[PDB]
Design a protein around this nucleic acid. Structure first.
Length: 367
RNA sequence: CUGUGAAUA
């Protein structure tokens, strides 16, 4: 209806419609996408003429959907006006439940130079608070997943400090921020500068690697350590350091913990032969507590509520490892599997009383 | 006796 559009335009009623659910649904459906349309131009001008009114509509539970529709149809001249408004209060808008959705769509829809100009407003702000915020963590992940890495180099510089990295990575929301950044930096962004990406990648990988023992044991940061272990190829130096300078010394203790046992499982699942052999050599020939009770680490892990899952992964690694083309490797994988199988047979009646022991017995009886 | 991770109508 055009009477409604002219009443919004002539009688200054845009705030009344945009802050009402059905009024704002009207504004989204009857906003013409064409930038040369006259109704489009006057409604856009009404939205952006007052900076404080524009920002209040971004933060409004219904008004933010209209601002999003204007972003979807925007051109360069409109985008420069929207960017200048959003830049005056960007950090607070990223914390807001409504306005952070406007920011996330603007990162997607603005021209890359304008979206970069927005994200550079975050450069000297409290980025720990933003990365662990329930709303702000999605803005950071959107920046990292959308813009080229040169638009957010300051984020990697911020996470280069070990205090910042540990605080963000050990958070329910901030571990998603760290993992998304690792995913983007370790992905082949072939249309961007290779060496710029790899320098940032190695700075963040070294940060995780320097703190790997604390992060692997943490409720949230253990996912990030698992991801670093799986990367390999040019990042294999970080996987090798994490296994050899942390996991090899701590394998038995980590396998008994709720979070770190997932890191041990991933290492057995994905590490190459040389590292798997060193991990098996720690299990069967390393430091064994109470050796008058325990023959090796299997005597602890077989009956443990988390360590039994490490044993199940060890079985699966050896079963697949017997197919190795190198008969020297497959001989070892078969001998580790026979050692596990003999220990399960010796303790079968105790193991049969538990769901863990039944799963281990069924996996071995499948062969 | 089975074991872990996100914000709008």
């Amino acid at each position: 209806d055009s009477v409604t559009l002219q009443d919004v335009l002539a009688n200054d009623a845009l705030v009344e419609f945009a802050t009402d659910k059905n009024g704002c649904r009207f504004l989204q459906e009857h906003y013409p996408t064409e930038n040369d349309n006259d109704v489009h131009q006057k409604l856009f001008r009404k939205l952006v003429e007052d900076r404080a009114i524009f920002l209040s509509l971004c933060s409004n539970m219904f008004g933010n959907f209209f601002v999003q529709r204007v972003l979807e149809c925007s051109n360069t001249e409109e985008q420069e006006i929207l960017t200048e408004h959003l830049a005056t209060d960007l950090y607070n808008l990223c914390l807001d439940k409504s306005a952070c959705r406007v920011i996330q769509l603007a990162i997607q829809k603005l021209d890359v130079h304008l979206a970069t100009r927005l994200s550079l407003e975050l450069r000297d702000t409290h980025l720990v608070r933003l990365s662990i915020d329930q709303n702000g963590n999605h803005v950071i992940q959107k920046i990292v997943k959308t813009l080229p890495v040169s638009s957010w180099t300051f984020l990697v510089d911020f996470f280069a400090d070990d205090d910042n990295l540990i605080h963000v990575c050990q958070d329910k929301y901030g571990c998603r921020v760290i993992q998304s950044t690792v995913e983007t930096l370790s992905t082949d962004q072939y249309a961007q500068c290779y060496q710029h990406r790899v320098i940032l990648l190695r700075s963040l990988m070294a940060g995780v690697t320097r703190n790997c023992t604390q992060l692997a044991s943490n409720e949230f940061a253990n996912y990030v350590v698992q991801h670093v272990i799986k990367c390999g190829d040019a990042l294999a130096v970080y996987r090798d350091i994490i296994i050899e300078q942390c996991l090899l010394q701590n394998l038995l203790s980590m396998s008994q913990e709720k979070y770190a046992s997932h890191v041990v499982e991933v290492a057995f699942e994905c590490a190459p032969y040389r590292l798997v052999a060193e991990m098996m050599n720690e299990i069967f020939e390393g430091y064994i507590p109470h050796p008058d009770t325990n023959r090796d680490a299997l005597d602890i892990l077989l009956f443990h509520q988390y360590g039994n899952y490490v044993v199940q992964q060890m079985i699966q690694t050896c079963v697949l490892g017997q197919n190795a083309r190198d008969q020297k490797q497959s001989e070892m994988y078969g001998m580790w599997l026979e050692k596990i199988h003999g220990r399960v047979m010796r303790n079968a009646h105790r193991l049969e009383r538990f769901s863990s022991g039944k799963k281990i017995i069924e996996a071995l009886q499948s062969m």
